[PDB]
């Protein structure tokens, strides 16, 4: 068993958008759990259902790393039982979530002088997402009776809105990279031991 590729998840140069968040499966490796929280760069470390100090003595079947970028003021919405735009239309965590949410400020990378429009979030949706559901469709949103025919007009809106990211924005409007580690332990033999 080799080392788990947590470094690729956390030190990736480019992170996904919150509506198209990346997920990486991790199994059959030795995990440096207690070594993940060694730097002071993490400005949000919140575990639900597992103690971060008990990870090194726990064997799991799978570890799923869901990575994306959101706004600072929206980092509070990455948690079970949260509501809002990110929680309802972009990324939803279940009520009985068992994992850890690690978010850090990336104003240096994900924020450009002219505005970084690569990161987008779903602004309109007819219903809230089920847990761990990803919606990437760019269909024009129909808020009225007249069909949109693929063109935005009155009562027809593009569902995805972009965070204009600039280095002058306040900390609540600066980009934050979020990685959610979900630990799955089924009856199958565990292979992601510490």
């Amino acid at each position, epitope marked *: 068993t080799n080392l788990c590729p947590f470094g690729e998840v956390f030190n990736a140069t480019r992170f996904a958008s919150v509506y198209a968040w990346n997920r990486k499966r991790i199994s059959n490796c030795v995990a440096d759990y207690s070594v993940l929280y060694n730097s002071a760069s993490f400005s949000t470390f919140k575990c639900y259902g597992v103690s971060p100090t008990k990870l090194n003595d726990l064997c799991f079947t799978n570890v799923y790393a869901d990575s994306f970028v959101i706004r600072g003021d929206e980092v509070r919405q990455i948690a079970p039982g949260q509501t809002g735009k990110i929680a309802d239309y972009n990324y939803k965590l279940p009520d009985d979530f068992t994992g850890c949410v690690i978010a850090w400020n990336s104003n240096n990378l994900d924020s450009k002088v002219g505005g970084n429009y690569n990161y987008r979030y779903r602004l309109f*949706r*007819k*219903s809230n997402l089920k847990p761990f559901e990803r919606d990437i469709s760019t269909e024009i949103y129909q808020a009225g009776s007249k069909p949109c025919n693929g063109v935005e007009g*009155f*009562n027809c809106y593009f569902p995805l809105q972009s965070y204009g990211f600039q280095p002058t924005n306040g900390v609540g*409007y600066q980009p934050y990279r979020v990685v959610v580690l979900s630990f799955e332990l089924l009856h199958a033999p565990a292979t992601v031991c510490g």
Partner: antibody
Amino acid sequence: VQLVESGGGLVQPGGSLRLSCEVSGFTVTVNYMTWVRQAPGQGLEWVAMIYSGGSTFYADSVKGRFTISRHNSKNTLFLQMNSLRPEDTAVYYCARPIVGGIAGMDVWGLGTTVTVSS
Amino acid sequence: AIRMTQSPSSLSASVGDRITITCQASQDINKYLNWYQQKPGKAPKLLIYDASNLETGVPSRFSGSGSGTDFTFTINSLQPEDIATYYCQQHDNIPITFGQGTRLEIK
């Protein structure tokens, strides 16, 4: 688009009143809808909000007493008010607020007067 | 809640003059401020969205500027039909809070 408020009037303190907002020109069930009140002689004050997916948000001064809902069959917004207080006497407007900076989206209703007094 | 401090509460002037309304947010709201106009006894009408963008059909004499905490709402040439109440509202932070209000009168 046309927003028409109704169901107001005068109610005794502690009573419950159901404000209705009939809508023409857009579907209520798939739009952001806000209820905003203005006391007589005072400024505007946001009261309630409902998202496209159904998530509801309320002001601190009204949380646990007001409830915003929607009806697709009649395409009407609803605001149920329980445990009414004298400071709730005001004019209430149902609006489709501008979301994401999309021009031409904002539209307000005429307003309904609610008088809570004995 | 984010407290909006809109000043002055009354800037009565004559037709053709310039109008300047200043709104201050307690926290940082980026650029998400909406300026609304309300006639006496009428529903408020959106004039400025995101603090610098004219709404559909609004006369170009209205303008807005500013980001962060301080915002300005300007009327280039005051007109008799502009006699109303003007509010500033932050909309991207729940709870949504309006400003104090500015009563525009005729001098």
